């Protein structure tokens, strides 16, 4: 019975990112998702939705892939689990590691360590960074630089890396070793700065932070190539070249957080290849399995890996492991997911349909009175709604313009997320999305945007 | 080809808890696990082993459960994934939450929050603890008391909770808010103390810590009912009653870490019921799914849940979520795992065969010159090897007596783990293990123990 399921839900299920009281009282209504196929999901009332967010930037090959279900099933039958401690493996996790390195990761990458979430992967990253510096005899070189509006997970250390205040409030974050530099969002740059000047500004602010803290105290810089949960914010022209030069100069490791950008999302293998980023370490999750099973990766470069090997020679085995590191069913899901990405050339589809997505959104919304900025890269896009387009004056947050546009689209059967800490409607459709489906999506969103504009303008 | 798989393994797979250099060079040989049934696994050379450790205290229903494979498959086909953000669900995760609370958790438990690892679950715990005190206007009440030899995960915050130095080395742990009190190991008590005196000693040491730090600065006490990775250390008689009274007196929350003890391991539903522990919060993983899929739980009591609800009323939705929180295939695995535990009464089997395990080990090893102590509870057991049994003098660690006994048993087809930071052979067999299999296990270990005794005595 549905009523009983919702009652049990309210009574006993603690959801992620859900108003605890309102959910439990029934004021925030529950929804049960019962199925999905391609880019469409179905709920408990039999309503069907076009999921223009692919879950949470993650159902990249689309819904209802029996090919992935079968691969999971065959592994679960043969050997659902053994540990990978003390050199133990399955054939699946070995094959996945070689495939990730050979076919998806940028040059200079060597090893992969496995977890289950982007959050646990970035936890592993910080442990590796501190280990690296300790074994090199640099005990002070431990601080991590992140960026405002960055998203790097929902833990204590990883939530500190995150630069969005909802992940800090009442959790005593950020910890002292995590510092944040500027959100490289050209649209909101100081008034009348060219793109080039804004990049110079970003560089100078990073230099200033490094001078305040001491380069000798800073171990790493973590960043998403394009910021996801922070609002689909692409880097300015020249940003990655300029930032990389600063980091090289001060001997600061670069972590590319590819949890959203990885595995074809931008129309390249990862954001790193897309922007010519040469990181020392890389975090992956989401599109690694298209969410068919939970799996995360830390991709270790040659430079860091050699220090890890030397660390082991001097100090014995590194004290790091998760019970389910390398989980066989999750590895199997990943392998089938990569087969599909490769066989259907979804990276190429993401480039083609992604450019179509950008073009259509600019046509529909580039002159719309509600829309301050249309932005995106490959198969990520967003509309940011603003009260004064020219002066870049936001709406009063209490007005909930982003959530309102999202809720209106949802009434008409499109899921596009109201992004946090702003009035931003985000798009992250499956990489199998067609040009026709883009038009259908944009059409429904157009009506949603007009409707809210009628209310608030 | 196997040779090529091992080459790829060495080149590209970073294992948990594995000597990085020695593994990569081939000095630490790899092993591929290809299958398994009941309590037995098979490797790449076709050797078969009795796994007396159930992976890592987790393959509780045994290997090769096609029933669990089928349930995983049916969910993966219907809907492998959607998020559970903003009140979204599957029927599977709702059913699991009601079943955990109604049929497994002790009295007073209300809600379950889902992750993928015991480590991410204890990360969630600490966030909950800090949130709880912040919303109550107690900003200074944040320190966490753990115990020496405790095992609570492998992150930065969770590795700090862990009381074993390998998880701290070169990671700058423990963090400042984590403090550690005594390992309640009666065998190693101050010389000549009765069990009751040792409990009083534990209480006084906890009181002393609380006085040093200030009760008003201490938020929680985390503990495993029986310590797992720290060496299978059962609490002394009266310990849990005495400690709980201290914590209640000082208004310190109690987190029962049931990652190993949960779901029948001790012959009770959880360690909490086994020892009459009434915790405020509970961590579960491992036996929740019998490792068939990665899933963890944070079970929130009524007292903490009420404050979470009030927090949401005043401050909006809590900033906490993992992408894969409530993952449908993992929920489905858990449901099938619980069906099996219940239908085959494996809790009862664990009680019966577990008592048999303790009896047989005491008969075989209670007078053995190599063995300082035989200990265990239900389906956890251990032998600790000591140079002087009466004086409780350990072997020189360089002698590697624990690892040597483990390696000898492994040659004869039994997997029993050499536990960290000591000479301890641990046992955590699947809950389907029979009395006859116990005898077989003990017999092989007997030979291994004799062989090493011949070398070192
Ligand atoms: C860029 C980025 N990093 C890290 C994470 C964390 O992933 P998880 O939600 O799997 O904990 C997410 C989500 C993300 O979008
Ligand atoms: C008692 C206890 N807590 C926490 C953990 C951490 O679990 P994970 O290996 O899933 O990261 C383990 C293992 C454990 O045995």
Q: What is the DSSP string of B88-134?
A: EE-HHHHHHHHHIIIIISPTTEEEEEEESSHHHHHHHHHHHHHHHHH
How far apart (Å, rounded) are the C-alpha atoms in residues B30 and A89? 7
Cα–Cα nearest to B83, from B323, B298, B297: B323
Quick check: B267 and B378 in contact, CB under 8 A? yes
Quick check: B37 and B50 in contact, CB under 8 A? no
**B56: contact with A, CB 8 A cutoff:** yes
Q: Which residue has the tokens 């930071």?
A: B421
Contacts of B91 in chain A (CB under 8 A): 5, 32, 34
Q: Nearest CB to A16: which of B35, B309, B322? A: B322
Pseudo-torsion of CA B265, B266, B269, B270, nearest 10°? Answer: -90
Q: Nearest CB to B66: which of A20, A29, A77? A: A77
Tokens of A76: 């679960």
Q: Which residue has the tokens 């438990």?
A: B109
How far apart (Å, rounded) are the C-alpha atoms in residues B162 and B171? 13
Sequential DSSP letters for B299-362: EEEHHHHHHHHHHHHHH-S-S---TTTT-HHHHHHHHHHHHHHHHTTHHHHHHHHHHHHHHHHH
Quick check: B15 and A325 in contact, CB under 8 A? yes
Quick check: A414 and A50 in contact, CB under 8 A? yes
Method: X-ray
Long-range contacts (CB closer than 8 Å, 24 or more residues apart) made by A343-350: A344/A61, A344/A432, A346/A60, A346/A61, A346/A264, A346/A431, A346/A432, A347/A264, A347/A267, A347/A268, A347/A269, A347/A431, A348/A267, A349/A431, A349/A432, A349/A433, A350/A264, A350/A265, A350/A266, A350/A267, A350/A378, A350/A379, A350/A431
Quick check: A95 and A335 in contact, CB under 8 A? yes
Interface of A with B in 87-106 (CB under 8 A): 87-91, 93-95, 97-98, 100-101
Quick check: B293 and B32 in contact, CB under 8 A? no
How far apart (Å, rounded) are the C-alpha atoms in residues A299 and A278? 12
List Cβ neighbours of A209 (8 Å cut-off, separation of 6 or more): A145, A179, A181
Burial A81-95 (b: 16+ CB within 10 A, else e): bbbbbbbbbbbbbbb
Q: CB burial class (10 A; 0-12, 13-18, 19+) of residue B3?
A: exposed
User: Which protein residue's CA is at the shortest distance from atom 4 of ligand 2?
Assistant: B152
Does ligand 2 have an atom closer than 6 angstroms to the CB of B152?
A: yes
For residue A291, report the distance from its CA to the centre of ligand 1, in Å. 12
Minimum-distance ligand to the CA of B260? Answer: 2
Long-range contacts (CB closer than 8 Å, 24 or more residues apart) made by B199-207: B199/B236, B199/B237, B199/B238, B199/B239, B199/B242, B200/B242, B202/B236, B202/B239, B202/B242, B202/B243, B203/B242, B203/B243, B203/B246, B205/B181, B206/B145, B206/B181, B206/B182, B206/B243, B206/B246, B207/B246
Q: Mutation test of ligand 2: which of B224, B259, B324 has the most ligand atoms closer than 8 Å to its C-beta?
A: B259
Residue A71 φ then ψ, to 5°: -60, -45
Q: Number of A to B CB contacts under 8 A, please give it.
A: 431
Q: CB burial class (10 A; 0-12, 13-18, 19+) of residue A147?
A: buried
Q: Ligand 1: which residues within 6 Å by Cβ?
A: A 117-119, 122, 151-154, 224, 228-229, 257, 259-260, 285; B 322-324
Contacts of A320 in chain B (CB under 8 A): 16-17, 154, 167
Q: Nearest CB to A313: which of B21, B130, B327? A: B21
Q: Under an 8 A CB cutoff, do B312 and A21 touch?
A: yes
For residue A282, report the distance from its CA to the centre of ligand 2, in Å. 25
How far apart (Å, rounded) are the C-alpha atoms in residues B286 and B284? 7
Q: CB burial class (10 A; 0-12, 13-18, 19+) of residue A454?
A: exposed
Q: Nearest CB to B89: which of A13, A157, A326? A: A13
Tokens of A401: 């313009």
For residue A152, report the distance from its CA to the centre of ligand 1, in Å. 5
Quick check: A452 and A401 in contact, CB under 8 A? yes
The vertex-B217 CA angle with B215 and B221, nearest 5°, equals 70
Tokens of A12: 């006993």
Q: Under an 8 A CB cutoff, do A81 and B135 touch?
A: no
Does ligand 2 have an atom closer than 6 angstroms to the CB of B158?
A: no
Sequential DSSP letters for A233-267: BPPPTTHHHHHHHHHHHHT-EEEEE-TTTTTTTTS
Quick check: A283 and A255 in contact, CB under 8 A? yes
Contacts of B33 in chain A (CB under 8 A): 79, 82, 88-90
Count CA atoms closer than 13 A to A404's CA, side-chain side: 19
How far apart (Å, rounded) are the C-alpha atoms in residues B270 and B274? 6
Long-range contacts (CB closer than 8 Å, 24 or more residues apart) made by B382-390: B382/B231, B382/B232, B382/B419, B382/B424, B382/B425, B382/B426, B382/B427, B383/B424, B383/B425, B383/B445, B383/B449, B384/B187, B384/B231, B384/B422, B384/B423, B384/B424, B385/B423, B385/B424, B385/B425, B385/B449, B385/B452, B386/B423
How far apart (Å, rounded) are the C-alpha atoms in residues B347 and B293? 21
Q: Under an 8 A CB cutoff, do B324 and A33 touch?
A: no
Tokens of B395: 């072997």
Residue A320 φ then ψ, to 5°: -145, 125
List Cβ neighbours of B196 (8 Å cut-off, separation of 6 or more): B237, B238
List Cβ neighbours of A74 (8 Å cut-off, separation of 6 or more): A332
How far apart (Å, rounded) are the C-alpha atoms in residues A373 and A388? 11
Which residues sit opposite B388 in a β-bridge? B393
Chain B interface, mutation test: which of A73, A82, A110, A299, most B Cβ atoms within 10 Å?
A82
How far apart (Å, rounded) are the C-alpha atoms in residues B99 and B255? 20
Sign of CA dihedral A435, A441, A447, A453: negative
CATH architecture of the region B1-64+344-457? Alpha-Beta Complex (3.90)
Q: Which whole-number Å values give the CA distances from A226 to A3, A187, A263, A354, B209, in the listed order?
A: 42, 15, 14, 14, 47
**B186: contact with A, CB 8 A cutoff:** no
How far apart (Å, rounded) are the C-alpha atoms in residues A315 and A99? 30
Q: Mutation test of ligand 1: which of A55, A152, A224 has the most ligand atoms closer than 8 Å to its C-beta?
A: A152
The number of residues in chain A equals: 457
Residue B166, SS3 per DSSP: helix
Residue B420 DSSP symbol:
T
Quick check: A160 and A178 in contact, CB under 8 A? yes
Cα–Cα nearest to A234, from A195, A278, A291: A195
Domain locations along chain A: 1-64+344-457, 65-343
Residue B423 DSSP symbol:
T
Cα–Cα nearest to B135, from A257, A20, A450, A454: A20
- B184: region left, alpha or beta (phi > 0 left; psi from -120 to 50 alpha): beta
Quick check: B234 and B137 in contact, CB under 8 A? no
* Strand pairing class (B143-147; B218-223): parallel
**B238: contact with A, CB 8 A cutoff:** no
Sequential DSSP letters for A310-342: HHHHHH-S-S---TTTT-HHHHHHHHHHHHHHH
Tokens of B98: 């009601």
Q: Under an 8 A CB cutoff, do A19 and B317 touch?
A: yes
Cα–Cα nearest to A416, from A440, A388, A389, A392: A440
**A13: contact with B, CB 8 A cutoff:** yes
Residue A33 φ then ψ, to 5°: -95, 125
Quick check: A178 and A146 in contact, CB under 8 A? yes
How far apart (Å, rounded) are the C-alpha atoms in residues B8 and A449? 52
Q: Nearest CB to B21: which of A64, A286, A312? A: A312
| B65-343 to CATH, choices 3.10.20.520, 2.40.30.170, 3.40.30.10, 3.40.640.10 | 3.40.640.10
Does ligand 2 have an atom closer than 6 angstroms to the CB of B327?
A: no
Q: Is the link from the previous residue into A174 a cis peptide, with omega within 30 of 0?
A: yes
**B294: contact with A, CB 8 A cutoff:** yes
Q: Under an 8 A CB cutoff, do A323 and B155 touch?
A: no
Angle, to 10 degrees, between the axis of helix B66-79 and the axis of helix A66-79? Answer: 170
**B3: contact with A, CB 8 A cutoff:** no
Radius of gyration for chain A, computed over Cα atoms and rounded to the nearest angstrom: 22
Residue A420, SS3 per DSSP: coil
Does ligand 2 have an atom closer than 6 angstroms to the CB of B258?
A: no
Neighbours of B256 (CB within 10 A): 27
- Work out the minimum CA distance from B161 to partner chain A, whole angstroms: 13
Neighbours of A97 (CB within 10 A): 27
List Cβ neighbours of A402 (8 Å cut-off, separation of 6 or more): A385, A418, A419, A422, A423, A424, A425
Q: Which residue has the tokens 């990112």?
A: A17
How far apart (Å, rounded) are the C-alpha atoms in residues A402 and B446? 69
Domains A1-64+344-457 and A65-343 share a fold: no
Contacts of A416 in chain B (CB under 8 A): none
Quick check: B329 and B114 in contact, CB under 8 A? no
Chain A interface, mutation test: which of B4, B94, B175, B178, most A Cβ atoms within 10 Å?
B94
For residue B224, report the distance from its CA to the centre of ligand 2, in Å. 10
Q: Which whole-number Å values give the CA distances from A122 to A116, A144, A201, B156, in the listed order?
A: 11, 12, 28, 11
Quick check: A167 and A148 in contact, CB under 8 A? no
Q: Which whole-number Å values give the CA distances from B219 to B183, B204, B210, B215, B428, in the listed order?
A: 20, 19, 11, 8, 32
Maximum Cα–Cα distance across chain A? 68
Quick check: A25 and A37 in contact, CB under 8 A? no
Which residues sit opposite B414 in a β-bridge? B50
Q: How far is CA B42 from the centre of its chain?
A: 24
Residue A95, SS3 per DSSP: helix
């Amino acid at each position: 019975s549905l009523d009983q399921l919702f009652e049990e839900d309210r009574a006993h299920f603690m959801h992620p990112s859900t108003h605890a009281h309102d959910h439990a009282s029934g004021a925030l209504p529950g929804k049960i998702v019962t199925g999905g196929k391609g880019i469409r999901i179905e709920d408990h009332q039999g309503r069907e939705y076009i999921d223009a967010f692919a879950g949470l930037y993650c159902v990249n090959i689309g819904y209802g892939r029996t090919e992935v279900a079968d691969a999971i099933y065959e592994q679960a039958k043969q050997l659902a689990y053994y540990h990978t401690y003390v050199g133990h493996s399955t054939d699946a996790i070995i094959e996945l590691s070689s495939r990730i390195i050979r076919d998806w990761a940028p040059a200079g990458m060597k090893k992969v360590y496995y977890g289950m979430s982007g959050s646990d992967a970035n936890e592993t990253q910080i442990k590796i960074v501190w280990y690296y510096n300790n074994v090199l005899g640099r005990p002070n070189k431990k601080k991590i630089i992140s960026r405002e509006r960055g998203y790097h997970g929902s833990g204590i250390v990883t939530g500190s890396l995150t630069g969005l205040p909802s992940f800090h409030q009442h959790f005593d974050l950020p910890i002292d070793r995590v510092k944040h530099t500027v959100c490289p969002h050209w649209y909101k740059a100081p008034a009348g700065m060219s793109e080039a000047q804004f990049v110079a500004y970003c560089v100078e602010e990073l230099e200033k932070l490094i001078a305040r803290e001491g380069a000798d105290t800073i171990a790493a810089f973590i960043a998403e190539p394009v910021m996801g949960t922070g609002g689909i914010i692409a880097p300015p022209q020249g940003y990655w070249e300029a930032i990389q030069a600063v980091l090289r100069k001060h001997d600061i490791l670069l972590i590319s957080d590819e949890v959203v950008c990885g595995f074809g999302r931008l129309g390249s293998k990862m954001g790193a290849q897309h922007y010519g980023i040469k990181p020392d370490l890389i975090t992956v999750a989401k599109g690694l399995t298209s969410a068919y099973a939970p799996l995360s990766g830390v991709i270790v470069g040659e430079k860091v890996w050699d220090v890890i090997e030397k660390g082991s020679q001097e100090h014995g085995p590194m004290g790091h492991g998760w019970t389910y590191s390398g989980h066989p069913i999750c590895a199997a899901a990943a392998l089938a997911n990569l087969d599909i990405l490769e066989r259907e050339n979804l990276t190429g589809n993401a480039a083609d349909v992604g450019a179509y997505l950008q073009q259509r959104l600019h046509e529909a919304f580039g002159a719309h009175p509600l829309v301050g900025e249309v932005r995106g890269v490959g198969m990520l896009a967003a509309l940011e709604f603003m009260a004064d387009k020219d002066a870049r004056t936001p709406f009063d947050p209490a007005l909930k313009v982003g959530p309102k546009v999202s809720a209106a689209a949802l009434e008409d059967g499109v899921i596009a997320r109201a992004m946090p800490h702003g009035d931003i409607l985000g798009f992250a459709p499956p990489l199998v999305t067609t040009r026709a489906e883009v038009d259908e999506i944009v059409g429904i969103v157009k009506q949603a945007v007009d409707e809210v504009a009628d209310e608030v303008l």
